[PDB]
C-alpha cells in the first residue's frame, strides 16, 4: 500500500493506492486536504458576502463560478439580468473556458512531462487576467459578476484588446497543437488510457469532458441554455471513444469553440445598463445614493442587510469548464441564504479514478487525474 | 542586416554613459537598454521610456543610488518608487 | 533575445577545446616536438625501445645517417 | 601507471567533493523485472561471443566467419522471438 | 607534465558541466518565451557556480549504511570523469588500444551505484524504483553495445583513435546513419535525461546538498561524453596532422550542438512510459540492431572492404 | 501480400528489420567480391616469411623477393 | 518583432507557421491608457412616471 | 583589509550571496495561490531569472511558499515537508488564507495561519496575492538573506 | 450542433505509397522532428519576461491592491463611522469601535482591517458613502511579522496619506462607471 500524496499529481491528492508491482490494482484517494467549510461559512453571510466564497471553489474557473450562483439567486428573485450583463457574462464565461482549459491540458502535460506547452499559454493566461483586473480589478477572484447582473461596466477599451487577444490566439493552440497532438510519446501516454464506457459515465454522473468524450451528447450550454447561449452559435465537440487523448482532443476543441462563442460576444455587445435596475436586489450607482434619499436607504440596507430574497429552493447547473458546477441554495426569506451544496464537476470525477483507473500503472494514474481537470477547491469544498 | 543589430547594440553600449556607465547598469539593473528619460523624481529614480519595445518593457525605472538614507545601490526593491510615479511604471495611467 | 545564450556556451567551449588542444601540444612538447609513439603492438614497443637505447635515454632523441 | 594516476585523482576529486560536503555545512517482488535481468545477461553473454568479431573479420576463413556469427544472431534472435510470442517482453 | 595534462582534461571538463547547466536553463528558456537566469552576474554566467556552493553549504544529509549512500554519488562523478580519460579528442590522454570496451565498461558500472542508492535507501519503492533503473541502464546497454559492435567492425578496431584514420574522407554517419539514431536515442536512455528520464520522474530525490550535487555534475558531464563519442564515431571532425587543433575545434562545434540536441529534445517532448520505454528497446530497436548488425559483418566480406587491423 | 502490405505501414521495424537480416544473408553469397575478403586479409603479411632451401629442384619459388615468380597482389592493386 | 528578416524566416519556417502576423508579445496596438470618459447609460426604471416598483 | 573581523565579514557576504542568488524553492500547492505563482514560473514575471526553481522536492528545497488554506487535515503534513526540508530553510506565507485565515479564519477545518504549524520568514498578503507580489515577497527574502551574518556571529560568541 | 474530433470518417485501404508514407513516419520519426521545429523557432522569438524591480506588470485603475483610508482635502479623515464597511465585509476583517469627537463629529476612535482576514473583495471599496475605505493602487506590502499585517487607523490613514495622489487619480478615472 503506497501512499502517494507534494504529490505529482494536482492540488493535494493523497491518493492511497495499492502496487500490485508497478501495475496499481487498487486507488482509495483520500480527499478532504482543502475542506475549508464553504458551505457553513456562507450560511453565516449574507448573499453578496458570500459571492466571494464562489470564486474559491474551483480556483482556475472564477467567473463561471460565480455565474451559477449569480442565476441561482436570481431565480429565487425571479429577476434577470439586464441584456448587455448577460452578453459580458458569456464573454467572461468563455474567457474563463478558455482559460480552464489552457490550465487543465498544459498542467496535465506538465504532469506527463512535456514543460514547454505550460510557458507558451501562461504567458497567453496573464493576457487574459489582465481583462479580469481591467474589468473587475482582481487577477484572479475578480467578484464581478453580481446576483443580480454584473458590478461595474466594461471599461471603454476592454472589447479591443478582448479581440486583439483573440485574434491572435488560435495560432497559440495551434503551436501547442503541433507539439503534443501527435507526439508518438503523448499520444501512447494519453491514447487508450482511462477509457470510460458512455453509460457508465451517465452512472457515475461525470457529467462534463468526461460525459462528452464517450460520445454521449449533453452540453448544459445548449440542453438548457442559461443567459444567452441561446443567441450564441457554437459546436458541441463530442469526442467518440473516451481515451485520455479524445477527452484532450475535445477541450483543444472547445477553447477553439469558445474563440467562435468570444467572437459572436463582442461582434453582438448590446448598449444598456449591467445590473438590473431595481434597487431592492442590485445596489444603486454612486451619484444616486450621494444624491437622493431612496437610493442612500437602499444602499445602506442592501450592503449593511441584504437582498432578503423569497423563501424557496433552487437547483440550478451551468456548464462551467470542468463540467455541471450547480448550487443547491435553500432559501428562507432571510437576507442570509439556509443551504448552498454546490455540487462539484470533480467530486463525481475523482470517484471515477478508481474505475477509470483499472489495470494501469503508476504513470497512468498521472494522466488519469490530469484529464479529470479535477481542482480541489471545488471537490473538498 | 546583422551589421544593423550591431550597430544599435553599440548604440546602447555607448549610451549609458561610459564604461562607468555601462556598469552601472549592467550589474545592478541587468539591462543595457536606451530609453528616453521621462522624468527623475525627487527621490533619485529616473524613469525611461522606449514605446518601441512590446508593453511589458516600454517603461522601466532605473533607482537610485541612496534613498531615505539606506543604499540603493544593489538592493534595489520596488516601493522605492513614488507613489505619484508608480502607477506611470504599473500603467494605470499613460500620463508622466 | 537568443544571443544571451551564448555567453554561456562560449564558456563550454573554450573548456572543450582546451584539453583537446593541450593533451596534443603537452605531448609534443614531452616527446620532443614529434608526436608520441603509439605502441599499440610490441614490435612498436620495441623498435620505440631500441631508439631509446640507440640514444640518450629517451626514445624522442633520434640518431640519423650521421652516426 | 598513466592510468592509475589518472584515476585516483579522479577518486580523490570525488572524495574531496564529498567530504566538503559532509565537512562544510558546519519487500518488493516481481517476475518480469527479474526475468529481463537474465534476459538481459543472456543478451550480455551473446555480446561477448559477438565481441572478437573485429578481429575474427580478418580471420583468412572469412566464409566460416560470417557462417558462425550469422548463426548466432540468429539463434539469440529467435530468443527473443519465442520471448515476445511468450507473455515475456510483455510485462 | 603529465598531470598539467591530467589537469586540463578534468578542470575544463568539470567548468564545462557547470556551464552546460546554464546553457541547459536558458535555451530552455528563450523556446519558451523567458530570458531564463541572466540577472546574477553577466548574462548568468556566475549562476552555476552559486547554487552548487547552496548545495554544499545546506546542512548534512540526515539518511539511514552510510556508505552505499556516500559510494554512490563517488561512483558517479568518479566514473563519469574517468571515461574523458581515452576520448581522442585529436589525440588521447591515455590512448588504450582496448578504448571502446573501457567507455562501454566504466558506463556500465554507472548501474552500481543506482543499484547501491536503494539498498541504501531503506525504502522498499525506492529499491523498486531503483530497480525500475537498471532496466533502462541495462537494457539500454544491451542495444547500445551492439550499435558500437556494428560500428568497430567497420572500423577495424576497438580503439577509439582509430576512427579518426577511418573518418578522414566521410562520417560515419552517412554509413550507418540508422544506427546512428539508435546511438543518439540510447544516449538520450543511458543519460536519463528527458524523453527517457523516470529518475526524477514518478518522485535522486533522496540525496541533498554534496550527494546531489555529485551524481549530478556526473549526469552532466556525461551530457557531454555520449554527446562527445557520438562526435567521434558517426560524426568525424575533420583531422589534419599538421594542424590537430582544427580536429578539436569541429569536436568542439559538433559535441556543443548534439549537446544541444538533447536539451532541444527535452523541452520538445513528453516523458514515455516505464513499459512504452522497454517496448520501444526490446521490440521496436533490437531487431533492427541485431539484423544491421549481420549487415555490419557482410557488407565487409562481399564487398571486400574488411578493413584493416591496426 | 496483403498484410505485407500492412506490416509495412503498422509495425514497419520488423518488416524492415527481416529485409536487412535477408539481404545481409544474401548478398554475402551473390557477389564479385566475396572471394577477395578471403584474400586481402589472406595476403596481409603479418609474420615473417621464413624462406625455403634452395635444393634447386623448385622452379616456382622466386629466389628473390622481386622476381618475376610467385604471388602477387596486383589483384589487390587496382581492385 | 524587431526580428531580423532572416530570424523571422526562420522563425516562420521552423514553426510552420507565419507567427509574425500573429505575435504574442505586445506591442501598440493595445488599447491605450486613460481611454476617454465614459458616460454609461441609465437603464429602465429611470423614468419620472409610470414607474410604479409595485408594477415591476 | 587586514582584519580577522573583515574576512569573516567578507565570507558570510559570499555565504549570504550564494544562499540569496539560488533560492530552491519547494511549493506545497494548496488553494489557488499555488496558481498565482505558476504565473511566477511562467514567462512574464519568470522566477528562474531570479535564480528560482520552478520545481524542488523537499529535500533539494531552500524555500517553502504555503499557498492556500492550510486545513486541519493537512497541517500534520507540512509540519512533515518543513521537518523534512534540508537545514538551511526559509518558509514564505503566501495569501491571506496561509498568512492568517482569510475567508475560512474561523472555519472549524482551517488552521488560522500556517505561523501557528510553521515559522514564517515572509508573509505576502493578498487573496490571490499577485505573482510580482509574490516576487517581492521572494525578493524580500533576498534582502533578509543577505542582512543574516552567521559567521560574524561564530566569531564574536 | 456538434463535431467528432477523433473520428476516422471512413477506411482508406492501404497503398503502398500510404503505406511507405506511415512507415517512414515510424521509422525516421518525421513528426517528432516536426516537434523540435516548433520549439527551435520560439527560440528565436523574443522572450516575454518583464525585469520585475525595473519594470513592473501593468495594472488598471480598479486594481484593489492593498487598503488605505482617505481624508478630505482640507484634512478632516473622510470616514464618518457609519460602520456598514464593517458589516458589508465578507470576512469580519474590519473592526470599528466610535465615538463623537470633541469636535462633537462622528469619527472611529479605532478602526482596524486584518489584512490577513481581508480577501481583497473591494466590497468596503464599493459600500463607503464617504468613499473613506479605498482599495489602494500598491499591492507589495509583504511583512516579515505577522503583527505588521494587521493594520490600525494610524497604518491606515498613513497609508492612504502616501498613495492619496494616484487614489485620487485612480478614483477620477473609474467614478464615472461606478
Ligand atoms: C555570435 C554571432 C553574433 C550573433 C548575433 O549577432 O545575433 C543577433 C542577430 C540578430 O538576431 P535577432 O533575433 O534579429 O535579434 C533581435 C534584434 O533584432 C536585435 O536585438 P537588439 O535590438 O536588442 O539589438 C541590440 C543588441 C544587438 O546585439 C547583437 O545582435 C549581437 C549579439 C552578439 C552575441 C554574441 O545588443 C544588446 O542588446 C546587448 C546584448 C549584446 C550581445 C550580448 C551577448 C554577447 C555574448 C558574447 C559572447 C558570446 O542574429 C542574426 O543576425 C542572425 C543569426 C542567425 C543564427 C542562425
Ligand atoms: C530532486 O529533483 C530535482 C532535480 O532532479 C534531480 C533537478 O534537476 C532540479 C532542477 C535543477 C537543478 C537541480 C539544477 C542543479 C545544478 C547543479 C547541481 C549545478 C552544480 C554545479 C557544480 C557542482 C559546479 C562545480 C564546480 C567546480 C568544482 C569548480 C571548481 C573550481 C531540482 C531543483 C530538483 O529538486
Ligand atoms: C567562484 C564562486 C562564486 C564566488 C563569488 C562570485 C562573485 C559573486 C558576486 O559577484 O556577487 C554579486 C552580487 C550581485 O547581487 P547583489 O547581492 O548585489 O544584489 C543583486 C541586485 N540586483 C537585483 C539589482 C541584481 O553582489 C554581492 O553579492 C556583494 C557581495 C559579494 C561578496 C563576494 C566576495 C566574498
Ligand atoms: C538549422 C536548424 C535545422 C533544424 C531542423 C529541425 C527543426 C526544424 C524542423 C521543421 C519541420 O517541422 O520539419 C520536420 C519534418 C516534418 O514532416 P512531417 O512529420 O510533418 O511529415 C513529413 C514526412 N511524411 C510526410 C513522410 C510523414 O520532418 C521531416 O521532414 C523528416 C525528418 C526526418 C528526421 C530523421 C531523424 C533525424 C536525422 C537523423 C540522421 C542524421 C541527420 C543529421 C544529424 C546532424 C548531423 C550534423
Ligand atoms: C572507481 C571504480 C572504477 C575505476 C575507474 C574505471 C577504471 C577502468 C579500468 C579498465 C582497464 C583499463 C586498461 O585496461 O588499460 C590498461 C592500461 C594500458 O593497457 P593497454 O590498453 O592494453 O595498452 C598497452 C599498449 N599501449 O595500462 C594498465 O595496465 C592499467 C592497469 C589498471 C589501471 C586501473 C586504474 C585504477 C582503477 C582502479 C582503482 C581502484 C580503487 C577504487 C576501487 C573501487 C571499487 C568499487
Ligand atoms: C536479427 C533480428 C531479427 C528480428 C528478431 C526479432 C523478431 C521478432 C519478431 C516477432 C514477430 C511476432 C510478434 O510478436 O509481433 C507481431 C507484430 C506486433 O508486435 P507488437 O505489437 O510489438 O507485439 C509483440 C507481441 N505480439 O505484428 C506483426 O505481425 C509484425 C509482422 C512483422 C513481419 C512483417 C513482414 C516482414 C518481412 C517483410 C519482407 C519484405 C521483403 C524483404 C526482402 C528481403 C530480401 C533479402
Ligand atoms: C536500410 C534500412 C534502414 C532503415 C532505417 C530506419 C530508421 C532507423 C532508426 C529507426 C528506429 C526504430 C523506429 O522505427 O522508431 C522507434 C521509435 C518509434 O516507435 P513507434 O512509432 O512508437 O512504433 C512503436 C511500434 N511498436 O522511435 C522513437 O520513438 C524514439 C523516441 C524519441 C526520442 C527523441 C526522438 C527525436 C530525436 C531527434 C534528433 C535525432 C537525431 C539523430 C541523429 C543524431 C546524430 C547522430
Ligand atoms: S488566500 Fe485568497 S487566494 Fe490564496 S487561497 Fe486563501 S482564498 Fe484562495
Ligand atoms: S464605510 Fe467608509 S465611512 Fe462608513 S465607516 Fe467604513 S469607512 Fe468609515
Same mark, same amino acid.
Given at each position: ?21 508497478? =501495475? ?267 444624491? /437622493? ?62 474505475? $477509470? ?25 | ?78 516601493? $522605492? ?16 | ?67 | ?91 | ?59 548534512? =544529509? ?197 549537446? /544541444? ?50 | ?56 629442384? =623448385? ?21 | ?56 | ?72 487535515? =493537512? ?31 474561523? /472555519? ?50 | ?178
Amino acid at each position: 500500500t503506497l501512499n502517494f500524496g507534494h504529490p505529482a499529481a494536482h492540488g493535494v491528492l493523497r491518493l492511497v493506492l495499492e502496487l500490485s508491482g508497478e =501495475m496499481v490494482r487498487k486507488c482509495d484517494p483520500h480527499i478532504g486536504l482543502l475542506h475549508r467549510g464553504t458551505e457553513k461559512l456562507i450560511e453565516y453571510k449574507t448573499y453578496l458576502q458570500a459571492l466571494p466564497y464562489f470564486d474559491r471553489l474551483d480556483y482556475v474557473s472564477m467567473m463561471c463560478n460565480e455565474q451559477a450562483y449569480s442565476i441561482a439567486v436570481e431565480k429565487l428573485l425571479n429577476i434577470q439580468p439586464p441584456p448587455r450583463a448577460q452578453w459580458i457574462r458569456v464573454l467572461f464565461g468563455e474567457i474563463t473556458r478558455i482559460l480552464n482549459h489552457i490550465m487543465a491540458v498544459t498542467t496535465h502535460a506538465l504532469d506527463i512531462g512535456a514543460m514547454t506547452p505550460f510557458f507558451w499559454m501562461f504567458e497567453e493566461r496573464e493576457k487574459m487576467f489582465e481583462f479580469y483586473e481591467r474589468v473587475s480589478g482582481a487577477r484572479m477572484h475578480a467578484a464581478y459578476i453580481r446576483p443580480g447582473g454584473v458590478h461595474q461596466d466594461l471599461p471603454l477599451g476592454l472589447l479591443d484588446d478582448i479581440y486583439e487577444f483573440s485574434k491572435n490566439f488560435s495560432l497559440r493552440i495551434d503551436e501547442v497543437e503541433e507539439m503534443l497532438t501527435n507526439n508518438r510519446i503523448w499520444r501512447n501516454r494519453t491514447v487508450d488510457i482511462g477509457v470510460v464506457t458512455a453509460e457508465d459515465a451517465l452512472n457515475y454522473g461525470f457529467s462534463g469532458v468526461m460525459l462528452r468524450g464517450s460520445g454521449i451528447q449533453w452540453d448544459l450550454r445548449k440542453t438548457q441554455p442559461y443567459d444567452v447561449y441561446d443567441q450564441v452559435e457554437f459546436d458541441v465537440p463530442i469526442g467518440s471513444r473516451g481515451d485520455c487523448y479524445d477527452r484532450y482532443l475535445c477541450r483543444v476543441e472547445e477553447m477553439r469553440q469558445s474563440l467562435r462563442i468570444i467572437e459572436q460576444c463582442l461582434n453582438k455587445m448590446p448598449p444598456g445598463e449591467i445590473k438590473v435596475d431595481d434597487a431592492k436586489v442590485s445596489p444603486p450607482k454612486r451619484a444616486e445614493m450621494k444624491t /437622493s434619499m431612496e437610493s442612500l436607504i437602499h444602499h445602506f440596507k442592501l450592503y449593511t442587510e441584504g437582498y432578503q430574497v423569497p423563501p424557496g429552493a433552487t437547483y440550478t447547473a451551468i456548464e462551467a469548464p470542468k463540467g455541471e458546477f450547480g448550487v443547491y441554495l435553500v432559501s428562507d426569506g432571510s437576507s442570509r441564504p439556509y443551504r448552498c451544496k454546490i455540487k462539484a464537476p470533480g467530486f463525481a470525477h475523482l470517484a471515477g479514478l478508481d474505475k $477509470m483507473s483499472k489495470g494501469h500503472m503508476l504513470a497512468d494514474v498521472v494522466a488519469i487525474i490530469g484529464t479529470q481537470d479535477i481542482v480541489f477547491g471545488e471537490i473538498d469544498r | 542586416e546583422l551589421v544593423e543589430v550591431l550597430k544599435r547594440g553599440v548604440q546602447q553600449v555607448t549610451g549609458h554613459g561610459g564604461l562607468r556607465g555601462l556598469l552601472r547598469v549592467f550589474f545592478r539593473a541587468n539591462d543595457i537598454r536606451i530609453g528616453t528619460l521621462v522624468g527623475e523624481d525627487k527621490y533619485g529614480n529616473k524613469y525611461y521610456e522606449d514605446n518601441k519595445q512590446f508593453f511589458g518593457r516600454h517603461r522601466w525605472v532605473i533607482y537610485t543610488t541612496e534613498m531615505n538614507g539606506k543604499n540603493t545601490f544593489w538592493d534595489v526593491d520596488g516601493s $522605492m518608487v513614488p507613489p505619484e510615479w508608480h502607477r506611470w511604471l504599473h500603467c494605470m495611467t499613460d500620463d508622466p | 533575445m537568443w544571443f544571451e545564450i551564448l555567453p554561456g556556451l562560449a564558456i563550454m567551449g573554450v573548456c572543450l577545446v582546451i584539453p583537446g588542444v593541450s593533451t596534443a601540444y603537452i605531448h609534443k612538447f614531452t616527446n620532443g616536438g614529434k608526436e608520441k609513439r603509439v605502441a599499440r603492438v610490441q614490435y612498436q614497443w620495441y623498435l620505440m625501445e631500441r631508439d631509446r637505447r640507440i640514444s640518450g635515454v629517451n626514445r624522442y632523441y633520434v640518431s640519423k645517417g650521421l652516426e | 601507471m598513466n592510468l592509475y594516476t589518472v584515476i585516483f585523482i579522479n577518486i580523490l576529486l570525488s572524495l574531496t567533493l564529498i567530504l566538503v560536503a559532509f565537512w562544510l555545512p558546519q519487500l518488493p517482488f516481481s517476475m518480469k523485472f527479474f526475468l529481463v535481468a537474465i534476459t538481459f545477461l543472456l543478451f550480455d553473454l551473446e555480446i561477448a561471443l559477438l565481441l572478437p568479431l573485429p578481429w575474427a573479420i580478418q580471420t583468412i576463413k572469412t566464409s566460416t566467419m560470417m557462417i558462425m556469427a550469422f548463426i548466432l544472431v540468429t539463434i539469440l534472435s529467435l530468443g527473443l522471438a519465442y520471448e515476445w510470442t511468450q507473455k515475456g517482453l510483455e510485462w | 607534465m603529465f598531470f598539467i595534462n591530467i589537469l586540463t582534461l578534468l578542470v575544463p571538463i568539470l567548468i564545462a558541466m557547470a556551464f552546460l547547466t546554464l546553457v541547459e536553463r536558458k535555451i530552455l528558456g528563450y523556446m519558451q518565451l523567458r530570458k531564463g537566469p541572466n540577472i546574477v552576474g553577466p548574462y548568468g554566467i556566475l549562476q552555476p557556480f552559486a547554487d552548487a556552493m547552496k548545495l554544499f553549504m545546506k546542512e548534512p =544529509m540526515r539518511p539511514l549504511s552510510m556508505s552505499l549512500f556516500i559510494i554512490a554519488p563517488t561512483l558517479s562523478l568518479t566514473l563519469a570523469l574517468s571515461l574523458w580519460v581515452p576520448l581522442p579528442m585529436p589525440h588521447p590522454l591515455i590512448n588504450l588500444n582496448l578504448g571502446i570496451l573501457f567507455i562501454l565498461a566504466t558506463s556500465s558500472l554507472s548501474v552500481y551505484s543506482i543499484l547501491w542508492s536503494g539498498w541504501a535507501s531503506n525504502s522498499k519503492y525506492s529499491l523498486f524504483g531503483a530497480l525500475r533503473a537498471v532496466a533502462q541502464t541495462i537494457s539500454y546497454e544491451v542495444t547500445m553495445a551492439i550499435i558500437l559492435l556494428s560500428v568497430l567492425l567497420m572500423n577495424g578496431s576497438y580503439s577509439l583513435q582509430t576512427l579518426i584514420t577511418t573518418q578522414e574522407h566521410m562520417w560515419l554517419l552517412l554509413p550507418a546513419w540508422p544506427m546512428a539514431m539508435m546511438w543518439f536515442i540510447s544516449t538520450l536512455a543511458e543519460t536519463n535525461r528527458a524523453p527517457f528520464d523516470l529518475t526524477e520522474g514518478e518522485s535522486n530525490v533522496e540525496y541533498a546538498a554534496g550527494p546531489f550535487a555529485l551524481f549530478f555534475m556526473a549526469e552532466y558531464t556525461n551530457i557531454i561524453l555520449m554527446n562527445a563519442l557520438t562526435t567521434i564515431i558517426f560524426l568525424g571532425p575533420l583531422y589534419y596532422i599538421n594542424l590537430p587543433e582544427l580536429y578539436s575545434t569541429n569536436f568542439m562545434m559538433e559535441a556543443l550542438l548534439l549537446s /544541444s540536441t538533447f536539451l532541444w529534445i527535452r523541452a520538445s517532448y513528453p516523458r514515455f512510459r516505464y513499459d512504452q520505454l522497454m517496448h520501444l528497446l526490446w521490440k521496436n530497436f533490437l531487431p533492427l540492431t541485431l539484423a544491421l548488425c549481420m549487415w555490419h559483418i557482410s557488407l565487409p566480406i562481399f564487398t571486400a572492404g574488411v578493413p584493416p587491423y591496426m | 501480400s496483403a498484410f505485407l502490405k500492412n506490416a509495412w505501414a503498422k509495425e514497419p521495424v520488423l518488416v524492415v528489420s527481416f529485409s536487412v537480416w535477408g539481404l545481409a544473408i544474401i548478398m554475402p553469397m551473390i557477389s564479385p567480391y566475396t572471394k577477395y575478403a578471403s584474400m586481402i586479409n589472406k595476403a596481409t603479411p603479418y609474420n615473417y616469411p621464413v624462406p625455403v632451401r634452395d635444393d634447386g629442384n =623448385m622452379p616456382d619459388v622466386p629466389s628473390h623477393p622481386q622476381d618475376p615468380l610467385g604471388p602477387s597482389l596486383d589483384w589487390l592493386k587496382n581492385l | 518583432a524587431s526580428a531580423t528578416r532572416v530570424i523571422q524566416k526562420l522563425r516562420n519556417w521552423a514553426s510552420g507557421q507565419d507567427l509574425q502576423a500573429k505575435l504574442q508579445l505586445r506591442y501598440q496596438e493595445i488599447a491605450k491608457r486613460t481611454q476617454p470618459p465614459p458616460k454609461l447609460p441609465v437603464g429602465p426604471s429611470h423614468k419620472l412616471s409610470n414607474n410604479y416598483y409595485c408594477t415591476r | 583589509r587586514s582584519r580577522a573581523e573583515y574576512v569573516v565579514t567578507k565570507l558570510d557576504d559570499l555565504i549570504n550571496w550564494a544562499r540569496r542568488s539560488s533560492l530552491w524553492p519547494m511549493t506545497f500547492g494548496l488553494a489557488c495561490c499555488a496558481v498565482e505563482m505558476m504565473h511566477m514560473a511562467a514567462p512574464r514575471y519568470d522566477m528562474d531569472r531570479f535564480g528560482v526553481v520552478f520545481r524542488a522536492s523537499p529535500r533539494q528545497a531552500d524555500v517553502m511558499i504555503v499557498a492556500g488554506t492550510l486545513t486541519n487535515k =493537512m497541517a500534520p503534513a507540512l509540519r512533515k515537508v518543513y521537518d523534512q526540508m534540508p537545514e538551511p530553510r526559509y518558509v514564505v506565507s503566501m495569501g491571506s488564507c496561509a498568512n492568517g485565515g482569510g475567508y475560512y479564519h474561523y /472555519s472549524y477545518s482551517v488552521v488560522r495561519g500556517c505561523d501557528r504549524i510553521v515559522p514564517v520568514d515572509i508573509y505576502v498578503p493578498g487573496c490571490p496575492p499577485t505573482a510580482e507580489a509574490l516576487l517581492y515577497g521572494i525578493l524580500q527574502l533576498q534582502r533578509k538573506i543577505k542582512r543574516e551574518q552567521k559567521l560574524k556571529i561564530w566569531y564574536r560568541r | 450542433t456538434y463535431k467528432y474530433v477523433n473520428k476516422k470518417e471512413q477506411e482508406s485501404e492501404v497503398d503502398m505509397k500510404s503505406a511507405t508514407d506511415n512507415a517512414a513516419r515510424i521509422l525516421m520519426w518525421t513528426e517528432l522532428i516536426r516537434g523540435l521545429g516548433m520549439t527551435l523557432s520560439y527560440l528565436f522569438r523574443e522572450p516575454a519576461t518583464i525585469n520585475y524591480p525595473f519594470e513592473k506588470g501593468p495594472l488598471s485603475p480598479r486594481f484593489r491592491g492593498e487598503h488605505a483610508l482617505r481624508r478630505y482635502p482640507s484634512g478632516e479623515e473622510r470616514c464618518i463611522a457609519c460602520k456598514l464597511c464593517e458589516a458589508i465585509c465578507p470576512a469580519q476583517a474590519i473592526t470599528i469601535e466610535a465615538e463623537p469627537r470633541a469636535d462633537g463629529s462622528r469619527r472611529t476612535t479605532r478602526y482596524d482591517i486584518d489584512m490577513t482576514k481581508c480577501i481583497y473583495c473591494g466590497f468596503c471599496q464599493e459600500a463607503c458613502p464617504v468613499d473613506a475605505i479605498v482599495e489602494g493602487p500598491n499591492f507589495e506590502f509583504s511583512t516579515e511579522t505577522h503583527e505588521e499585517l494587521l493594520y490600525n487607523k494610524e497604518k491606515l490613514l498613513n497609508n492612504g496619506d502616501k498613495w492619496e495622489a494616484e487614489i485620487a487619480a485612480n478614483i477620477q478615472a473609474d467614478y464615472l462607471y461606478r
